[PDB]
């Protein structure tokens, strides 16, 4: 009789834990349901051709936030340490005084993947274009600097000296990039004209022709000066892609030949109506675009890459390609599968072989899919409510049995 009384009484405390498990799980499933209803409403809103890709991009961002919130609740909700929505798990609770007098609680893994929505996407592809990044650098042209005319008579005519035989020292000319100027050193004057020996600015015709202007007077050769033998002229030069940028791409799985011929570009994205907006910078290798940072002031280029632990256990990196459904999403390709860069970061494919792949296209019949998920959640909520009634009825029956024994 004592065994029974103490056993039934403890069995009743056990039943209360079943009820707690059930309420903790229901609470969380209620929150998941709220997030799913918002997702459904957002899908209805996206099914409107008046929406621009910018609009859809905004709706998608919010859908992704809701889905992530669902994965948060699913992964962290707990009762005495049990992650009730994290795995399929049949919990058995003894509700009688003897072995086997139990009620099972069938917990199920409920997350965006098991609900069939981790690839849910309402975006549309942008028309992707690019513009080569250049710089302005002074170069030449076969137009040599002709200073043969600036002879003794010409130098005398411009400076007013008469003593000695003056000449362009070394027949050399110096160039200042800062102001597209030219300079020469004059020597040879003697007597009181010796003071005219020094440096003078000269004018270069849109031809070799170098000349000294009347009234000319020696100045100070501008620092930064440098000898040029042909006419200087500014022409666009493709931004230089560094070895470490190329090597970062290769380390990141980009083909060696393609990476070696990488080109810095500025992205552009045009929508279905024809409107175009500028994107960020990227390294175009082969026919693919890999996101990159670019310091206009320095020319320093930094290839964006994602680090992670491969299935073989080692640490590797993947180049962040511009792709995904919209065409401007940072994705990575690892061992036969494509993932969103942000999701693969820090991931351990050895410890967790499974990671959701990036959406490859716009979702077809999204509402049918969101509705299926809502039905899965309602089905689990119903079952939990019924098992809650079974625990409650057990508590009632245990209470009476104990009453009569005592």
Residue numbers in the entry: 54 to 459
What does the report in the manuscript say about this coordinate set?
Many S. enterica serovars express one of two distinct flagellins, FliC or FljB, in a process called flagellar phase variation. We show that both flagellins of Salmonella enterica serovar Typhimurium, FliC and FljB, are methylated at surface-exposed lysine residues by FliB. Lysine methylation increases the surface hydrophobicity of flagellin, and enhances flagella-dependent adhesion of Salmonella to phosphatidylcholine vesicles and epithelial cells.
However, while the structure of FliC has been determined previously, the structure of FljB remained unknown. In order to map the identified ɛ-N-methyl-lysine residues to the structure of both flagellins, we determined the crystal structure of FljB. Interestingly, the methylated lysine residues are primarily located in the surface-exposed D2 and D3 domains of both flagellins. Notably,  except for two lysines in FliC and three in FljB, the detected lysine residues were methylated only in the presence of the methylase FliB and most of the lysines conserved between both flagellins were methylated. Further, we found that a single flagellin molecule can contain up to 16 (FliC) or 18 (FljB) surface-exposed methylation sites. We note that the preferential methylation of surface-exposed lysine residues suggests that the methylation of lysines depends on some structural feature of flagellin and might occur only after flagellin has at least partially been folded. Deleting the D3 domain also removes the majority of methylated lysines and, interestingly, FliC∆D3 and FljB∆D3 strongly affected invasion of MODE-K epithelial cells.
